[PDB]
Amino acid sequence: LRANLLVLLTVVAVVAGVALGLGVSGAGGALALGPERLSAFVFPGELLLRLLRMIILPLVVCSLIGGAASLDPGALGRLGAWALLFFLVTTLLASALGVGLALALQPGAASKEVLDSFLDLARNIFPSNLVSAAFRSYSTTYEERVKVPVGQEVEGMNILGLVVFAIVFGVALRKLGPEGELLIRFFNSFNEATMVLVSWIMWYAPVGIMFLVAGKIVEMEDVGLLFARLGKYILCCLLGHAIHGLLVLPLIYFLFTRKNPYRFLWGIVTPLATAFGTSSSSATLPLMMKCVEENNGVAKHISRFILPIGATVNMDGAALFQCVAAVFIAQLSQQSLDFVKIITILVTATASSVGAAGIPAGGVLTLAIILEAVNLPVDHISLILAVDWLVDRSCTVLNVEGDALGAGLLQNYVD
Ligand SMILES: NC(=O)CC[C@H](N)C(=O)O
């Protein structure tokens, strides 16, 4: 099956990218290649990232509008509220687990005001311009007029504001009744065309992923040397993802529904493998909906609401990774975490996970939110970037798994 072919090709692409990076490093790596050759060698991964970032905007906006407009107000008050509560609770639990694992395992064993960071988050939630929000985000800087904060708009898609606006606009379209059906159809057709584009991009995804991994491994001085530093961090991220996906989320599924959660996961394994390979829940959306509807019997409306929304708003893996990274930093640099700082980390991780793009680059783009809110050195992300190619795949797997289990839980709640 071509879906299984895509999964196989993407996993083999990750493995072959690791092998190619190791081989290139054995031949001298960047030092031997020189910028001229290195840029061309790494270019295909950049091209894949550009292709996915191009489709983020229309994909997210149209999917969210359609999902929000897929339920009537009679169901929005019950299904919508419960879905929002489930997403919030799951993200909070993922962030708490990340904090706990990072503090316990201590990965690092051996500037913007917090108020300004939260105000910037609130401003990004409510964008002042929809067109500007498509490629810019609010950010506060300081001028010694005593520091006085002045707010600029800096490069970077405002996924959070676009998500909020899309959900609100879908709800408004549902409110309109027959008058809004034309726009619902328009946005559904646009989303379907964007999914066709995503399916086409996923066929280039193998080569792009291979070259991206190879470049990210050639960039570092030596795998055996960088992994010496980052082994505890990688272990914390992967262990937290495994605990959340195999124990916590299944435990919630079993508590709110007396069905077997792993039987549910068996019917979405293929979505999970595609998520691991591509590391883009947005690209995993179609197969995910197909599996939840057919293999697990989730009702059509339940899926069409929960999954397109969850894929952008709900990301337990992204939240857990960002939280474990925010705790890993502050240990590379000798800062300390108290209860207030931990709670700030949790809240900022929730907001950042909501504001992440469902693609390979989602995590680090918004980890800066947490780092600024905890006043941690932002430049340290350069280290995480050297390994993000590995953690991000588990992040995406958990992000899609949360969506699937939420769909099942809501389907049982509606029964
Ligand atoms: N590192 C992350 O979690 C970013 C988002 C993730 N790649 C996803 O598709 O869900």
280 CB under 6 A from ligand 1?
Answer: yes
Q: How many residues does the chain have?
A: 415
Reported resolution, Å: 2.9
Atom of ligand 1 nearest to the CA of 360: 7
Orientation angle between helical segments 81-105 and 316-328, nearest 10 degrees: 30
Are 369 and 351 contacting, i.e. CB atoms less than 8 angstroms apart?
yes
Question: In angstroms, what is the span from residue 362 Cα to ligand 1's centroid?
Answer: 5
Domains, the chain, ordered by start: 2-414 (1.10.3860.10)
Instruction: Please state, in angstroms and as integers, the Cα–Cα distance from residue 48 to each residue in 55, 134, 201, 205, 360, following that order.
Output: 11, 20, 8, 7, 10
270 CB under 6 A from ligand 1?
Answer: no
Mutate to test the pocket of ligand 1, among 313, 366, 399 (most ligand atoms within 8 A of CB): 399
Are 331 and 105 contacting, i.e. CB atoms less than 8 angstroms apart?
no
Report d(CA 170, CA 186) in Å as an integer.
12
271 CB under 6 A from ligand 1?
Answer: no
Question: In angstroms, what is the span from residue 280 Cα to ligand 1's centroid?
Answer: 6
Nearest of 302, 323, 313 to residue 402 by alpha carbon: 313
